[PDB]
Amino acid sequence: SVFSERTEESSAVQYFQFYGYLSQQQNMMQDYVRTGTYQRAILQNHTDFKDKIVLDVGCGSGILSFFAAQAGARKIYAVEASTMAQHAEVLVKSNNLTDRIVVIPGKVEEVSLPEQVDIIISEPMGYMLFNERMLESYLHAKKYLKPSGNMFPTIGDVHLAPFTDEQLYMEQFTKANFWYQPSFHGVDLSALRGAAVDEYFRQPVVDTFDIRILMAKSVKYTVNFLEAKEGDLHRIEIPFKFHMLHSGLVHGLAFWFDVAFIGSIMTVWLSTAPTEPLTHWYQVRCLFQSPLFAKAGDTLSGTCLLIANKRQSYDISIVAQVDQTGSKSSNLLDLKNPFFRY
Amino acid sequence: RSVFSERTEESSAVQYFQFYGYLSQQQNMMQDYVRTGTYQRAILQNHTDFKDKIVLDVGCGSGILSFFAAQAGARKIYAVEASTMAQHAEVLVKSNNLTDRIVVIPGKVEEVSLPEQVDIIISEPMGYMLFNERMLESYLHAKKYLKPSGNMFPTIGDVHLAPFTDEQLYMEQFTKANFWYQPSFHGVDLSALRGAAVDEYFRQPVVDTFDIRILMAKSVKYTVNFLEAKEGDHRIEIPFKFHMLHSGLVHGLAFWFDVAFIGSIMTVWLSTAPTEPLTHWYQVRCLFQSPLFAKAGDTLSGTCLLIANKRQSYDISIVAQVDQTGSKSSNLLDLKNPFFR
Amino acid sequence: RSVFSERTEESSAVQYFQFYGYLSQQQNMMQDYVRTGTYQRAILQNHTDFKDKIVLDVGCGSGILSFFAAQAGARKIYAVEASTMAQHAEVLVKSNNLTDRIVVIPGKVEEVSLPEQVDIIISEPMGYMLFNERMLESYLHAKKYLKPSGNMFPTIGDVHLAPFTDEQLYMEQFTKANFWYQPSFHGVDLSALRGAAVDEYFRQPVVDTFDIRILMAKSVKYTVNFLEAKEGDLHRIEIPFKFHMLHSGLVHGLAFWFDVAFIGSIMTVWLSTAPTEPLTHWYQVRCLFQSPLFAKAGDTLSGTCLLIANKRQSYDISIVAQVDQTGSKSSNLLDLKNPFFRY
Amino acid sequence: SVFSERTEESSAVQYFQFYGYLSQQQNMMQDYVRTGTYQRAILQNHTDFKDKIVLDVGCGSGILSFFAAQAGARKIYAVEASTMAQHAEVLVKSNNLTDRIVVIPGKVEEVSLPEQVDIIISEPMGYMLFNERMLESYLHAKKYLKPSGNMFPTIGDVHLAPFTDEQLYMEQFTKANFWYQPSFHGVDLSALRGAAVDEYFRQPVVDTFDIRILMAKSVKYTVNFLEAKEGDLHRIEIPFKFHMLHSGLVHGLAFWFDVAFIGSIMTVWLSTAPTEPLTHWYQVRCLFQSPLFAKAGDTLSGTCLLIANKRQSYDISIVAQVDQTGSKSSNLLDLKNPFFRYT
Ligand SMILES: Nc1nc(=O)n(CCOc2ccc(Br)cc2)cc1CNCC[C@H]1O[C@@H](n2cnc3c(N)ncnc32)[C@H](O)[C@@H]1O
Ligand SMILES: Nc1nc(=O)n(CCOc2ccc(Br)cc2)cc1CNCC[C@H]1O[C@@H](n2cnc3c(N)ncnc32)[C@H](O)[C@@H]1O
Ligand SMILES: Nc1ncnc2c1ncn2[C@@H]1O[C@H](CSCC[C@H](N)C(=O)O)[C@@H](O)[C@H]1O
């Protein structure tokens, strides 16, 4: 299938084992902002669901399918690849909705769906929006979408901003300097210090932070799910030019994302920005290998290049320079193995 | 085709050896001062067991235990490591000018060739509850390289079990499961999934420490002798009979382990008991879905059954009974999915 | 047949009036100084509503409220009491030299024959949650004896309800029911009865007091005007509510208290059982949800508290509450006759 | 029926409503001395149950019937008059025992059994053994017992002993002296002080105590449940002659009870004595109206007369005198309404 061709089997085994736990579904469901916003986006746009045919890509426990049912959908196809599909079926029966929701166990790239649908709903966002590569599954499902059907969410915006965090940068060396000693129980460890530094700097940091560390207005990269093809997500080239609002040392780039549900009645936004209540996506920070000094009014330009890999994630190549001075740095990070600092 | 790959799902082995490829994770184990200092003491204080000997280090990681064997006078040390950490170990061997004593051998101990038989095997193969990760079986397998009267460091392993009371922990886990009792979560009746949620949460062994006053009986001991055991020794049946010292609710069983290095100069013990300074193994508690009441003087009897699985862990079955009343508790746990409290 | 007997199971009534025959229970009410001092102040400070008037005391107990009416100058006081406490009231009337003014009439107010119409009725008919015991219906029934110009002391009653958070109370009740989850109690599997046990323990309203900081929204008020209400008005009591949540968290149930006002010609005097006021022997009352509701500050919590009178001198309570922003609902049935006295 | 003729309807309704609560069944089941001793008595005498026919009088949740099944019984008829019969039936089904336990809802005086039984099991003991009058239902059930059938429990012993407790005695007057004041909010309450004293003294005290308050060795009255008839329990006369071990003031008589399960293999005892761990029966104390001084070596002689009443309890009359001086005291008590003093 399309999925097997792009995914290492060992990655997929761990991935769907993770989503097979009720405790993991619960942690998503108890994200009030996440769950409440999906509900309002569906219910408040009821004319997008009443008497419609719906596809739910990666339905988990089924919660979003039940919302589409609350909004009056005539028939909902709920596709789920993990063993959570058996629990969703239990809930469809116990909620007396077997006439309106059919759970289809399997990957959306592999199952057979009988008819075209009016609207696709899904929650395919990962860290920095793109982690997990589920957005490609969501776009792949548009083979089942009628012309002039809709997508919920309709667009995804990933945001990037430069930050200063002296304590985060210095902490990498505090940890790595464990190895910089001549007699750890009699052993000189210091030949491994550089390798330890490199290992730490390749990890994106998942945690949150005070918005006062941000040094410029973010730059936005928009994916329009109604128009994009899954091939568009294999190599994501994000140019940036930041107009610095504050003077100081820039230690890296911070990432968050928004999605918008563009319905016939209204548009509803779900934001994971650090100005908004915290979600289970937190935010993501990638360090430069060396800080760059920038003055307020300088411009910080470069590119963030996301290169998809077969571990359902991306290699992150960042390059940046202060235009008015020529100072430049870079880094290359492995998004599959972030450091959870929160 | 090897013993390892026959008993191990590929996906599990990938994550396992990737985890141990991180320098940060070697640092974490190395900074366990009780663990690292105790291993050094067991080896240096039994220096006569290493002096001019041939050594095998099973799963050497950064190489730290091989360096201890070199300090103790070993003539040659084969340091076997299957993760990419083997490359970092070789860097340290060169930088410490021990290329004449420590020889790194990349690969699984079930698959590599050694030039000669060895006088003693060293390893740190203990996981949570002693047996997690199934590395003890690699340690035992390595005895194919051991001369007839060779030694093993560690030599024996003791698992300890004991009933405990802890209402707070019980209700902390019940409360999480109660989420799946709601008849109307955003309008959706979840309650049909409530038994499946209880089952899932209570299958998680709880890893953390606790005050010793929560133990309701003296612990029962189960001993594995690494000089004698075979790696097939896969299905572990631990019977127990506790003489209760206090009355109250028995919420589950607590587990810890000790290993002893039985050297020619002295026996050195590394203990993870709750009476001892904390280690990165902490302790493990397996909860009952429903607590049993017993009084002082009663006997609590049963069996802890550990079945090894292909994910490098164990399926745990605990059945316990208050002999005086016939009150019985039967519980299942997945040592692969612990809850780190 | 009497109106009382037609609405009351004999077994309930026998136990009810036996309870009130004990001097120790009269002492308990009398030693509630907020209650007794507030009644005395309502009567004496509105003495012109009693001077040279004819008074009916409904359910007089030991007679204390009739003595207050006599202190305020009432010409004649008919003190009606159905328990055996009536005989002790007669003793106090004689020993306080008030035989010319206080006339004990033993029996139910629905069944006695009163000698004449009265200017004012006094009573203490409030139970837990105001409505327990159904004695408000006897109070209203007694208006058959009230002159057109007449007054009622108390004159109105306000019931207050508000959402609360209290995980400890919830866990306490849930832990008791968990006994019936056991798969092997002395070798017996009890767990088929777990749902029945939860239902039973959560049917009990909790009578005790609490810190006002557990309250998550301003209370909603429901008023009964004793001058205007008819007996039959209290057979079905429907209290709608819409709360504006002031705090985020779990709503474990609704809290209840009540105030009564004595609206006299000189002043209005209030007796409050609110948790902001000194404790009384009515305490406060909390009805738990089997399933707590999560709400955010600014959300609305809406629904209905419905009280249906029953033949055991109490009410079957149904509470349905819903968080409007999410459609999360909780439905609960409670048996007001049999509370859990937690204090 | 025999039951309805001896029981006021109102008492019966309240009584079986009480036992219809799972929480009350849980209270009894959690009494570990009670429940464990019954289980030991049945299981350790397994030859009295193996392949036998059993009747469980007042089975409640069914717990004792499950113990009989554990001991090998072929058939158990489990009779229960409260709505708890519905819950027991649920447990019989969920424990896969419908082929061996037959729940029969109703009063044992009124249901029909399809055959005679080898052994009757029951827990009919109330406060100081006799409260609730359920021993009569247990004895009534012998109409279903085969000749040389057995009873578990087989005998019951009530123990009586004189006690000294100055603080318990004085406490009655502290409470009653609430009424001895001339102006409680303007009212002279004093005329009711005597009636308040009398009311307190009529209540047996349920709580526990230190065994050193006991002034003489106990006297024992035995009911043999194999031989006794219902009528024997309507008038229970217990004479006593205490030989005083300590000098001091005797303030009343203390009561407790033991039962014995006299099986083919061994006899097992369940004791509620103050020398044994506490049960939910505690102990019971009946004050004298006036204390009696006795010296060590004196004799305290008298009678405790228990008269059954139609509220499922007893009127207690106690008369006692110190033989060497003639000093005499008495008291009349209502066992139905004890004072629960325990904390
Ligand atoms: N809601 C969330 N909560 C979170 O915590 N995160 C962060 C998780 O970050 C991780 C990082 C590394 C690893 Br490794 C694992 C997680 C992300 C989301 C959004 N994702 C919704 C997932 C549902 O979609 C299903 N699903 C996926 N692909 C499918 C397909 N092709 N066909 C069919 N069903 C498919 C999958 O089984 C699950 O039910
Ligand atoms: N003041 C209070 N303080 C409290 O704490 N509570 C808590 C109640 O707790 C209870 C516990 C168990 C049971 Br069961 C019942 C209640 C309640 C009240 C209000 N109750 C005053 C009743 C007086 O009025 C009499 N009475 C009633 N109906 C009559 C009629 N129809 N005709 C004539 N006399 C009638 C009744 O005999 C008694 O003297
Ligand atoms: N079958 C096997 N063959 C070779 N190495 C193995 C193995 N199974 C596990 N290992 C390795 O054994 C190590 C266990 S951690 C112990 C590290 C080191 N000996 C120290 O004390 O610091 C890991 O590095 C893991 O990669």
Ligand SMILES: Nc1ncnc2c1ncn2[C@@H]1O[C@H](CSCC[C@H](N)C(=O)O)[C@@H](O)[C@H]1O
């Ligand atoms: N005449 C009668 N007929 C049937 N049941 C009766 C009865 N009189 C009392 N009972 C019942 O007897 C029980 C006594 S309590 C004992 C309950 C249970 N056998 C146990 O040991 O735990 C109550 O449940 C009560 O409802």
